[PDB]
């Protein structure tokens, strides 16, 4: 069932963190790229974001995602969610904070999704590359060849013993809930949000309220506000401020853990052998850079090793 995998992820919520090159001027993005993993053997990468995929407030669904604008969590159907590095990658799966994709090599990682006319893009620099399997340096997995042992990120969202922790969110500063009532500033607290305040208009008047609390000073610029929401936890990123007290550790499983399976490698064309007195001549005609290693079966091996890129003849 879906509820087994989405058990602890229902208790969590998205967040807004710092993203460099979100548009052109490094805004605060609803989806923020953290900790790209790209060390498989088929060019398949795993991207962890700050949004939530495969989750809706009402119920779990694989065609609905959850994100945050302001302080309100919004749910939008996944319509155009794209990952591109230098060409548009074909994403495999998504589960909570994580996206799995199959990307061509390049120097950047980009994600984006629309809801209405918005764009919501984040780009984080990261050098991904294609890692072939075997002694031939191909640039794409072939139609046919020889099976070789390879390790790749599986597309199953099971537990598999790997965990990450989630924490209570830190105070979040909202400036939209401070307004002037008639000539004094007023605090609007939505649904028991317990807004903290800090005024230094003639002096310090720090304190915690839960309802109304019209502050007795003039300007909105000389007072700050916060918000302690404790309903849903968040993953402790490095782009979020920590809490005040001691914070418990959660246990959120990493869905797409690395496994070891099978990979397809290219087979080189057969060389043409010519026999001479104590001499072996190989006419090699390769299409990819290929490795040729020889040795002798005597007391000294005398090993040779060279990468063949052009059609050469070796004696």
């Amino acid at each position: 069932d879906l509820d087994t995998h989405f058990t602890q992820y229902k208790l969590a919520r998205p967040y807004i963190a710092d993203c460099p090159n979100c548009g052109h001027s490094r805004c605060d993005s609803p989806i923020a790229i953290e900790e790209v993993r790209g060390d498989a053997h088929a060019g398949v990468i795993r991207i962890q974001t700050s949004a939530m995929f495969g989750l809706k407030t009402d119920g779990v669904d694989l065609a609905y995602m959850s994100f945050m604008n302001g302080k309100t969590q919004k749910s939008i159907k996944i319509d155009n969610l794209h990952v591109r590095t230098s060409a548009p990658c074909s994403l495999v799966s998504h589960h909570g904070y994580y996206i799995l994709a199959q990307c061509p090599p390049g120097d950047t990682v980009t994600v984006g999704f629309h809801d209405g006319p918005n764009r919501h893009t984040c780009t984080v620099a990261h050098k991904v590359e294609f890692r072939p399997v075997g002694r031939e340096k191909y640039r794409h997995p072939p139609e046919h060849g020889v099976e070789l042992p390879c390790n790749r990120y599986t597309h199953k969202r099971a537990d598999q013993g790997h965990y990450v922790e989630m924490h209570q969110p830190g105070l979040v500063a909202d400036h939209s809930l401070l307004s002037i009532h008639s000539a004094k500033v007023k605090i609007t607290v939505p649904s028991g949000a317990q807004v903290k305040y800090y005024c230094k208009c003639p002096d310090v008047r720090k304190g915690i309220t839960s309802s109304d609390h019209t502050t007795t000073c003039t300007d909105v610029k000389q007072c700050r506000a916060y918000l302690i929401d404790n309903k849903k936890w968040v993953y402790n990123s490095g782009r979020l401020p920590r809490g005040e007290g001691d914070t418990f550790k959660g246990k959120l499983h990493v869905p797409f853990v690395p496994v070891k399976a099978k990979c397809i490698a290219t087979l080189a064309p057969e060389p043409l052998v010519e026999h001479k007195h104590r001499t072996l001549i190989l006419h090699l005609h390769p299409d990819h850079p290929t490795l040729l290693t020889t040795r002798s079966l005597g007391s000294d091996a005398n090993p040779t090793r060279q990468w063949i890129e052009r059609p050469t003849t070796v004696n």
């Binding site: 069932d1 879906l2 509820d3 995998h5 009402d58 199953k156 099971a158 028991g192 309903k231």
Partner: protein, 79 residues
């Protein structure tokens, strides 16, 4: 045509037993997500009218946590 510790759907492809109605249709026809029993819900959670389990802390907080909204109905919470 595989080991009895493996499962085969109506197409003929053989998958493992751990992929039996786990939520993902592994083979083409998706008959692996058809015939299995529904698990029971926890005692510490609150049961909705449609059966969506929510934690008991989320009951009577002034926010919808269910599709049917039975966790915030006046019949289930005296106001």
């Amino acid at each position: 045509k595989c080991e009895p510790s493996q499962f085969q759907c109506t197409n003929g492809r053989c998958i493992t037993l751990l992929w039996k109605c786990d939520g993902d249709e592994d083979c083409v026809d998706g008959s692996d997500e058809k015939n299995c029993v529904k698990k029971t819900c926890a005692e510490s959670d609150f049961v909705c009218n449609n059966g969506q389990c929510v934690p008991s802390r989320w009951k009577c907080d002034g926010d919808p946590d269910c599709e049917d909204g039975s966790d915030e109905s006046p019949e289930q919470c005296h106001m």
